[PDB]
Amino acid sequence: RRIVPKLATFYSANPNHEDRINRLERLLRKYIKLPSQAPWISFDEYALIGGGTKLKPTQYTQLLYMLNKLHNIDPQLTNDEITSELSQY
Amino acid sequence: PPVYRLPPLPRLKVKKPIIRQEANKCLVLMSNLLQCWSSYGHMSPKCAGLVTELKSCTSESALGKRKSNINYHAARLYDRINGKPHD
Amino acid sequence: PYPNLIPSANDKPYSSQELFLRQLNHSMRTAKLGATISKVYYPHKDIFYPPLPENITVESLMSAGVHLGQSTSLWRSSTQSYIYGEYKGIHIIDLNQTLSYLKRAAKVVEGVSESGGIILFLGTRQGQKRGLEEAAKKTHGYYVSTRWIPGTLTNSTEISGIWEKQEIDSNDNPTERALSPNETSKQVKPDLLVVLNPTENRNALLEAIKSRVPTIAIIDTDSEPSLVTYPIPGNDDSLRSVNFLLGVLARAGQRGLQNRLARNNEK
Amino acid sequence: TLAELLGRSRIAQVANNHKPLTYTGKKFHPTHQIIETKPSTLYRQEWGLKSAIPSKIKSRYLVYNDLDTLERITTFEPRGGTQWNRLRFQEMGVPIVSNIGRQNPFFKKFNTEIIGTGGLSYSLPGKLKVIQRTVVPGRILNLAAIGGFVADVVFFQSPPSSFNSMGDFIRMKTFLFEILEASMEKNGSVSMHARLLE
Amino acid sequence: IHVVPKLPNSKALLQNGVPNILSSSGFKTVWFDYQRYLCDKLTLATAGQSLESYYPFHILLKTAGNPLQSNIFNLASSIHNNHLFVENILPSAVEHGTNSNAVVKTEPSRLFLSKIKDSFNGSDWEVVKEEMIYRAENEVLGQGWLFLVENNEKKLFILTSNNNGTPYYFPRNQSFDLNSAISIDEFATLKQMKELIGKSTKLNGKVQDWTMPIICVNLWDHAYLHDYGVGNRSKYVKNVLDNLNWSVVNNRIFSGISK
Amino acid sequence: MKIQTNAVNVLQRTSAYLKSGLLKETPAWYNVVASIPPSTKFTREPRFKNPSNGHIIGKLVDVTEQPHANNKGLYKTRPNSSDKRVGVKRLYRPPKLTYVEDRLRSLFYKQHPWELSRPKILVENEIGDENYDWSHMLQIGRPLDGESVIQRTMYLIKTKQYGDMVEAYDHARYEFYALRMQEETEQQVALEEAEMFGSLFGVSAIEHGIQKEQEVLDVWEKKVVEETELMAARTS
Amino acid sequence: LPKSKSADVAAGLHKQTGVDPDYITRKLTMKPLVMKRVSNQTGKGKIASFYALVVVGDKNGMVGLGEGKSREEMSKAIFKAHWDAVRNLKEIP
Amino acid sequence: KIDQSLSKKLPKGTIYDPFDFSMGRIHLDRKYQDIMKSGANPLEFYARPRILSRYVTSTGRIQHRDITGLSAKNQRRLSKAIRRCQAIGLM
């Protein structure tokens, strides 16, 4: 066996946050064609799961942007996978 | 013809980048009084049609009124614009 | 795959929530079989279906822009050996050499990947966030898209001990076993740090040299062909180029990864 | 050969030109060749130049003079758009006398002078689209810019009220003009005549 | 460059062909020459032009405005229409079982039965077959195609496709024969269209009409003049309309759900 | 920087640690950079011939290799200044890739500036599969451009169908015009015909030419609303 | 649940650089060379410090000169210096 | 009726653009706004006080090579011709 980092972003500055963003980005690409037509976790709340002390405002704003756009997908066309990913936040 | 490369500098910021804001609008108003008081005497029979303006300029605030973002533009586009040799 | 669907009904005019699914069926199925554009490069390519190390050619590089160099005004003289001549104030690279350099480079990745190698492709110019991510996707390698936290390698047990480490097997199967505090608290050195924009990531290059870690980069007509183990003459600027070169290295890595995950099957 | 490859390179297919990217001088003929990019490359931020074009650019058409320069950037103006003017000449459908076309329709060792239509026209002069042309709307300068080409406005009688109606927005107002005709002075300049329908 | 798409088991077509419809011949002056001629003509038009990276069907739609590009567009549509045409006239025999397919062709599919019923007000599809011939004979003065067309109004109607009209973009279906003077009532449709599209694209949006075509029958000279003949223009339509592989038509109707 | 040592010398460095005890387990990569040793020479290798103009870089005209008094009616015998100015840097100096075709390119574009205005597919697609028979100024894949005219004049000067470069180019220049002339008619035909065959058009070249222009007028009109007026107060 | 100076010096680098602990604690000798007391004129009072060059090497074929510095204790800087040297070991031909 | 500083008047000869018809453009232009300069021994005009009268701040003053912008040699010979003309009665 081998001891190895879990996240592919491990070596980056804030790896956990980057990983979290990547899943949302993947979802957006997948459902990029789906037509578009609030209570998101706080910065501090996000930090505890995300980067912690290494979480920056810009990163949080980006995360919010990613979530909001995904949420905006017309409720009728939305998927189960998307909703599961958004459930966290 | 045109050509004037510079020598490397700590940074190419700008001094007080002058954005320009009109002179205390009041300062112009008070000035015109003394630009129509020198002649015609104090409270000129004409300045009635002037002090009318310097009134509220004071009132609540005797001084009716008691930026730029080029330094970062410079800080970010100098290590690129400066034609430094390689390294 | 449409749980939220209410097939309009009978007289209801085509529901505009599913009308689109008709266009989706109109695509994957009928699509445009009548006339199909061929012999045409797409930015979609390279990053996904790349040339195997042996399939490369000078023309493929010239097309991908792995030749156009920096200006005949910013040339670190340290490459009169990799330059092929000047054109339009640009120093065209001797791609003939680039090929030899890319050939060898790819070889290192495959061999490294065939040895549980920990590759960590690094690039910071805008656009590589995907090409790189996808590059490590294939070789089960690791990647960094933003700026390289100075200290990642040397000052590791400080910059990178918060992140967790997973015990992987020879088929890269998470062992799903506990890693002791001290065990998970040490150094996870990379065994082949690929750099895609050497011009401005030395902090990593210099660190790896002092980290006894082999490096592989994409030198230009300005980058110094010396701070790296395997220099690969190329064009650092354009991303089609980098994505071509990275792609070749990526697939070289994949083949090894494949060959390695195959020995395990024998037993 | 390395050179053979470059000798056919699209980069070299485009000739060099250091003409200013502002050219305050009166303009008649284009100065540089616009570089067209498939929307794909635009998202890939690829333009085939020495350095990638900044995402700030959202056009698919740009003009470049220096693949790259000392300032470590490529000198390009994303405002390359002649594609519109010339096409509008086709939208205007009017041919150029081109002096006399002895033998060859454009006639003329090197045809540097009197180059010809200048790629502004490759159609038989006479055709029936002329049917009184197609009264193309133009922006009266006082002269009227029709399809990006100024044409002197002419009328049966001078209509001051028409100019008064647009006031100082004479150029802002666009009036259909039965183009009388156009011509390419040897300096590659098109001179045309308009028909103010007022 | 583009590549004329290989026909299912063209092996037979090379000397054999589509039963009844045509032996070899035909496609020799169509798929294996006409199609290429304009496929190349487009590939030659696409040269140096983004319009190419994308399938010409995408271009066909793309080349909607800027009518100055119509030259390429008309040809483009013809390219698209023809393959749809070949698909309708595709023998597309089923494989496996080794023995030659027994052509148990599913005729008017179940869904198709109701589709036409509503489309032509409780009328039989086969009834439409000759009605179609009636329409085509009285809706063409030269070149064109025939086209069953499903609409957002699920009326699976049929459109008077001409020369190389856009079976999708209503504003460019090429139905009115501007050459043959039309009754003021068609002009009313013209007036509407002038207004209808005038405001649709007015917000950067060519009428988003999901007018999806269904059954294509080329009416170009190559279609009939090439072999069947002149007065046989209708007669050629006859055998074609007599039998159409439904597998494709079955999959030319948004009949089910997906994601 | 300066040709560094601790970059291409990692195996040498690790080997030592591996033989002593500073390391216990070899860095996996160890073997790879052994199998594929790192090019260490960083020599400014010299050049001998220009890859393009076929010129030679490395010769001197010994005087004996000459006997005709120069145009300047004069038999030169003693070697001249430049002819003794050690030109070693020239060998290392990368030579200019001069191409007469490039001159023809500029020449054609100067004579036909609208060709530059014409969109060109500078983006090069797999240049490998591009063998093109250029006896005709048209090719499948490659679009029409002044570049085609240039690659065309080559046959007429290589195959020698015509004579000198000037005459050759012109022969194809008229060849180009024709293709362009026919295209112009084709362009109009699409519309005219389509125009006279059930065709509606949302916006034409004249329409973008007016809408965008009128849009601009929105800004200018509002702008002068401040400038002209502000001056009245600025001067009254 | 949780030369000796050298034992730590090594452990830290083991957890960090990857050098093997045993080699550092049993097959090296740190012999200080210069142990001075430099100082800085901070405004908050002349501050002193302890520069130290402690050469550690295996008397077989590997030497490394490491420097160091503290403001608390000279031995503290020596520990740091053992570190900078075990870190900078180099084979002497 | 309108002020000058707000209305480009491209001649018909040119190619007007949608932007070209804008104020931005006007500002832009402003920002980017000679037989001696041709190559005639400027000194030969040691007399002709007419020709030399040109490159002169109209105050018996020659101009720094920021305005004149004539070739170093051309400007220095022009300056010498002006100085020589001072000696040659006229100017």
Chain F contact partners (≥3 CB pairs within 8 A): C, D, E, G, H
Q: Where do breaks (C to N over 2.5 Å) occur in chain H, by preceding residue number?
A: 33
Give which of D189, D191, D192, D193 to mutate to test H binding, by max H Cβ within 10 Å.
D189
Q: Are strands D144-146 and D174-177 parallel, antiparallel or unpaired?
A: unpaired
* D72/C contact by beta carbon, under 8 A: yes
Structure-block tokens of residue F123:
């983006």
Radius of gyration of chain A (CA): 14
Residues recorded for chain A: 89
Residues from chain H that touch F228, judged by Cβ atoms under 8 A, are 2-3, 6
Amino acid identity for residue F182 in this structure: Q
Angle formed at CA C134 by CA C133 and CA C136, multiple of 5 degrees: 70
Of D46, D105, D188, the CB nearest to F113: D188
CA distances from C215 to C102, C114, C241 (A): 13, 17, 19
Q: Are C122 and C201 in contact (CB under 8 A)?
A: yes
Specified resolution (Å): 3.2
Q: Are strands C215-216 and C193-194 parallel, antiparallel or unpaired?
A: parallel
Q: Which residues of F82-105 are buried (b: 16+ CB within 10 A; e: fewer)?
A: eeeeeeeeeeeebbebebebbebb
CA distances from F5 to C232, F10, F37 (A): 18, 9, 15
> Which residue shows structure tokens 């790192």?
F38
Torsion of CA C102, C106, C107, C110, to 10 degrees: 180
Helix (H) or strand (E) holding A57: helix A57-72
Q: Which residues of F190-224 are buried (b: 16+ CB within 10 A; e: fewer)?
A: bbbbbbebbbbbbbbbbbbbbeebbebbeebeeeb
* D86/E contact by beta carbon, under 8 A: no
Q: Are the beta carbons of D36 and E53 separated by less than 8 Å?
A: no
Q: Are C135 and C249 in contact (CB under 8 A)?
A: yes
* C2/A contact by beta carbon, under 8 A: yes
- Please name every residue paired with F230 in a beta bridge, in sequence order, or none if there are none: none
Chain E contact partners (≥3 CB pairs within 8 A): C, D, F
Amino acid identity for residue F96 in this structure: K
Q: Which residues of D137-153 are buried (b: 16+ CB within 10 A; e: fewer)?
A: bbbbbebbbbbbbbbbb
Chain H contact partners (≥3 CB pairs within 8 A): D, F
Q: What are phi and psi of C207, to 5 degrees?
A: -60, -45
C118: left (phi over 0), alpha (psi -120 to 50) or beta: beta
Q: How far is D57 from chain E (nearest CA, A)?
A: 18
Q: Are the beta carbons of C43 and D52 separated by less than 8 Å?
A: no
Who contacts C11 (Cβ-Cβ below 8 Å, separation ≥6)? none
Q: Are the beta carbons of E254 and C40 separated by less than 8 Å?
A: no
Q: Are strands D136-140 and D174-177 parallel, antiparallel or unpaired?
A: antiparallel
Q: Are the beta carbons of F35 and C107 separated by less than 8 Å?
A: yes
DSSP state of E31: I
How far is the first Cα of chain F from the last one, in angstroms, to the nearest whole number?
Answer: 66
Closest of C87, C89, C80, C78 to residue F91, by C-alpha: C80
- Please name every residue paired with G55 in a beta bridge, in sequence order, or none if there are none: G31, G65
Helix (H) or strand (E) holding C133: helix C128-139
Closest of F181, F95, F172 to residue F136, by C-alpha: F172
Secondary structure (3-state) at F98: coil
> Which residue shows structure tokens 């039309």?
E182
Distance CA D172, CA D165 (A): 12
- Please name every residue paired with D138 in a beta bridge, in sequence order, or none if there are none: D175
Long-range contact set of residues G59-63: C-beta below 8 Å, sequence gap at least 24? G59/G29, G60/F20, G60/G27, G61/F16, G61/F20, G61/G91, G61/G92, G62/F16, G62/F20, G62/F22, G62/G89, G62/G90, G62/G91, G62/G92, G63/G89, G63/G90, G63/G92
Burial class of residue A64 (count of CB atoms within 10 Å of its CB; 0-12, 13-18, 19+): middle
Q: Are the beta carbons of H22 and F219 separated by less than 8 Å?
A: yes
Of G18, G23, G90, the CB nearest to F21: G23
Q: Are C132 and C143 in contact (CB under 8 A)?
A: yes
> Which residue shows structure tokens 């180029």?
C241
> Which residue shows structure tokens 């074609």?
E240
Outline where DSSP puts E strands in C69-217.
83-87, 90-93, 120-122, 142-144, 165-168, 193-194, 215-216
Closest of F33, E103, F57, F176 to residue C214, by C-alpha: F33
Residues from chain E that touch D39, judged by Cβ atoms under 8 A, are 50
Amino acid identity for residue C156 in this structure: S
Of D11, D111, D172, the CB nearest to F111: D111
Structure-block tokens of residue F114:
């609208």
Count of other CB atoms within 10 angstroms of residue D61: 17
Q: Are D112 and D104 in contact (CB under 8 A)?
A: no
- Please name every residue paired with C85 in a beta bridge, in sequence order, or none if there are none: C92
Helix (H) or strand (E) holding A2: strand A2-5
The string of DSSP letters for C49-94 reads SPPPGGG--HHHHHHHTSS--SBTTS--GGGTTTEEEEETTEEEE-
Residues from chain D that touch E48, judged by Cβ atoms under 8 A, are 36
Distance CA D108, CA F177 (A): 13
Give which of H1, H3, H16 to mutate to test D binding, by max D Cβ within 10 Å.
H16
Angle formed at CA C245 by CA C241 and CA C246, multiple of 5 degrees: 110
DSSP state of A30: H
Who contacts E36 (Cβ-Cβ below 8 Å, separation ≥6)? E4
- Please name every residue paired with E144 in a beta bridge, in sequence order, or none if there are none: E162
Residues from chain F that touch D124, judged by Cβ atoms under 8 A, are 181, 185
Distance CA C169, CA C173 (A): 5
Q: Are the beta carbons of F143 and E67 separated by less than 8 Å?
A: no
- Please name every residue paired with D193 in a beta bridge, in sequence order, or none if there are none: D152
> Which residue shows structure tokens 């936040």?
A89
Q: How far is F193 from chain E (nearest CA, A)?
A: 9
Ordered alpha helix ranges (H), chain D: 2-7, 10-13, 39-43, 82-92, 160-166
Q: Are the beta carbons of G20 and F16 separated by less than 8 Å?
A: no
Show which of residues 10-39 on chain H sit within 8 Å of chain F, judged by CB atoms.
18-19, 21-23
Helix (H) or strand (E) holding E221: helix E221-224
> Which residue shows structure tokens 């679009």?
F143
Closest of C237, E177, A12 to residue D51, by C-alpha: C237
Distance CA G19, CA C3 (A): 57
- Chain-centroid distance of CA E111 in Å reads 20
* C169/A contact by beta carbon, under 8 A: yes
CA distances from D163 to C98, E95, G81 (A): 67, 76, 89
Residues from chain E that touch D38, judged by Cβ atoms under 8 A, are 50, 53
Ordered alpha helix ranges (H), chain F: 10-20, 32-35, 88-92, 100-111, 113-117, 146-158, 165-195, 205-235
Of E48, E49, E68, the CB nearest to D91: E68
Structure-block tokens of residue H60:
């018996």
Q: Are the beta carbons of D70 and B80 separated by less than 8 Å?
A: no
Q: How far is F9 from chain G (nearest CA, A)?
A: 13
Q: Are A18 and A9 in contact (CB under 8 A)?
A: yes
The string of DSSP letters for D127-165 reads -----STT-EEEEE---EEETTEEEEEE-SS--HHHHHH
Amino acid identity for residue H8 in this structure: K
Distance CA C33, CA E57 (A): 9
The string of DSSP letters for F107-152 reads HHHHH-HHHHHS-B--SPP-GGG----TTSS--SSS---HHHHHHH
Burial class of residue G49 (count of CB atoms within 10 Å of its CB; 0-12, 13-18, 19+): middle
Structure-block tokens of residue F151:
């690659």
* E71/D contact by beta carbon, under 8 A: no
Q: What are phi and psi of F49, to 5 degrees?
A: -140, 140
Closest of C231, C244, C239, C198 to residue C61, by C-alpha: C244
Residues from chain C that touch G18, judged by Cβ atoms under 8 A, are 187, 189
Q: Are the beta carbons of C224 and B86 separated by less than 8 Å?
A: yes
Q: What is the 3-state secondary structure (H, E, C) of E159-220?
A: ECCECCCCCCCHHHCCCCCCCCCCCHHHHHHHHHHHHHHHHHHHHCCCCCCCCEEEEEEECC
Q: Are F22 and G20 in contact (CB under 8 A)?
A: yes
Outline where DSSP puts E strands in chain E.
145-150, 157-159, 212-218
Distance CA C159, CA E67 (A): 61
Helix (H) or strand (E) holding D64: strand D61-66
Q: Are B43 and B51 in contact (CB under 8 A)?
A: yes
| Chains B and A are in contact, defined as 3 or more C-beta pairs closer than 8 angstroms | no
| Chains G and F are in contact, defined as 3 or more C-beta pairs closer than 8 angstroms | yes
Searching chain F, which residue's CA lies closest to the CA of residue C57? F128
Residues from chain C that touch G1, judged by Cβ atoms under 8 A, are none
Q: How far is F231 from chain H (nearest CA, A)?
A: 10
Distance CA C111, CA C104 (A): 11
Long-range contact set of residues G45-50: C-beta below 8 Å, sequence gap at least 24? G47/G71, G49/G77, G50/G74, G50/G76, G50/G77
Distance CA E140, CA E180 (A): 10
Q: Are strands D189-195 and D149-154 parallel, antiparallel or unpaired?
A: parallel
Closest of E156, E154, E158, E136 to residue E145, by C-alpha: E136
Residues from chain H that touch F224, judged by Cβ atoms under 8 A, are 2-3, 6, 23
Angle formed at CA C214 by CA C213 and CA C215, multiple of 5 degrees: 115
Ordered alpha helix ranges (H), chain G: 4-16, 21-26, 74-87
DSSP state of E145: E
Distance CA C220, CA C83 (A): 9
Taking the CA of residue B58 as centre, how many other CA atoms within 13 Å lie in the half-sphere pointing to its CB? 6
CA distances from E125 to E118, E158, E161, E214 (A): 11, 11, 19, 14
Count of other CB atoms within 10 angstroms of residue H79: 18
Torsion of CA G14, G16, G17, G18, to 10 degrees: 40
Q: What is the 3-state secondary structure (H, E, C) of chain B?
A: CCCCCCCCCCCCCCCCCCCCCCCCHHHHHHHHHHHHHCCCCCCCCCCHHHHHHHHHHCCCCCCCCCCCCHHHHHHHHHHHHCCCCCC
Distance CA D125, CA D104 (A): 13
CA distances from A77 to A31, A34, C19, E205, E259 (A): 10, 7, 11, 22, 8
Residues from chain A that touch C5, judged by Cβ atoms under 8 A, are 76
Q: Are C146 and C122 in contact (CB under 8 A)?
A: no
The string of DSSP letters for H44-67 reads GGGS-HHHHTSSS-SSS----TTT
Q: Are the beta carbons of A2 and C20 separated by less than 8 Å?
A: no
Closest of D73, F120, D46 to residue C241, by C-alpha: D46
Q: Are G15 and G39 in contact (CB under 8 A)?
A: no
Who contacts A44 (Cβ-Cβ below 8 Å, separation ≥6)? none
Distance CA G9, CA G15 (A): 10
Give which of E46, E50, E68 to mutate to test D binding, by max D Cβ within 10 Å.
E50
Amino acid identity for residue H65 in this structure: R
Closest of H42, H41, H33 to residue H82, by C-alpha: H42
* G62/F contact by beta carbon, under 8 A: yes
Closest of C205, C101, G91, C223 to residue F11, by C-alpha: G91
Torsion of CA E114, E115, E117, E119, to 10 degrees: 160
Secondary structure (3-state) at C174: strand
Q: Are the beta carbons of D2 and C70 separated by less than 8 Å?
A: no
F·H CB contacts under 8 A: 29
Who contacts H67 (Cβ-Cβ below 8 Å, separation ≥6)? none
Distance CA F164, CA F104 (A): 13
Q: Which residues of D115-129 are buried (b: 16+ CB within 10 A; e: fewer)?
A: bbbbbbbbbeeeeee
Who contacts E232 (Cβ-Cβ below 8 Å, separation ≥6)? E224
Torsion of CA G59, G60, G62, G65, to 10 degrees: 10
Q: Are C108 and C75 in contact (CB under 8 A)?
A: no
Distance CA G65, CA G28 (A): 12
Technique behind this structure? cryo-EM
Residues recorded for chain D: 198
Who contacts B65 (Cβ-Cβ below 8 Å, separation ≥6)? B24, B25, B26
